[PDB]
């Protein structure tokens with residue numbers, strides 16, 4: 001919103017408590033609607049594209065899809081966005097991709113979330129979201145059943161530097177802001 005890359009880096013390393021204390025003090029209801037989310041993070045009056053991205057990001061973190069990001073979804077979201085353990089983030093990204101929570105990531109689920117968080121904008125060269133998705137399965141869906149187990153995910157993404165970056169760093173705070181002020 002209103003800060004440079006160096007500022008975003010410092011925030012990325014800012015303690016959870018600082019983020020939580022500010023949220024709970026400003027949102028006593030323990031919830032944020034999308035509008036309040038924009039106000040809180042200084043994300044309003046963005047271009048149509050950036051605004052759209054902000055909306056889908058909000059929806060992505062709105063785990064129970066009730067239209068609000070509550071105190072639990074807030075810290076879970078920050079656990080992925082802020083600096084943390086790559087080892088721990090692998091499982092949390094998997095859970096995010098597993099839309100229906102059946103313990104497996106199917107082609108459709110991966111495609112939807114990948115588009116939502118614009119992960120392919122991180123790539124480098126021509127790569128459609130549908131193309132990148134089919135590539136992921138072609139490369140890490142070992143038994144070719146159309147589903148990614150946690151095992152296949154962790155194993156495959158850790159053996160491919162490209163998959164690791166695009167699939168588990170798309171929500172880094174610095175990458176999000178860099179993505180925002182770049183759509184308008």
Ligand SMILES: *C(=O)CCCCCCCCCCCCC
Pocket residue numbers: 001002003004008041042043061069073074075077078081176177
């Ligand atoms: C512009 O520079 C805004 C700086 C603050 C970035 C806010 C982006 C927050 C998105 C991830 C956090 C989600 C917490 C539920």
Ligand SMILES: [Ca+2]
Pocket residue numbers: 062063064065066067068069070073
């Ligand atoms: Ca919610």
Ligand SMILES: [Ca+2]
Pocket residue numbers: 098099100101102103104105106109
């Ligand atoms: Ca699933």
Ligand SMILES: [Ca+2]
Pocket residue numbers: 141142143144145146147148149152
């Ligand atoms: Ca499989």
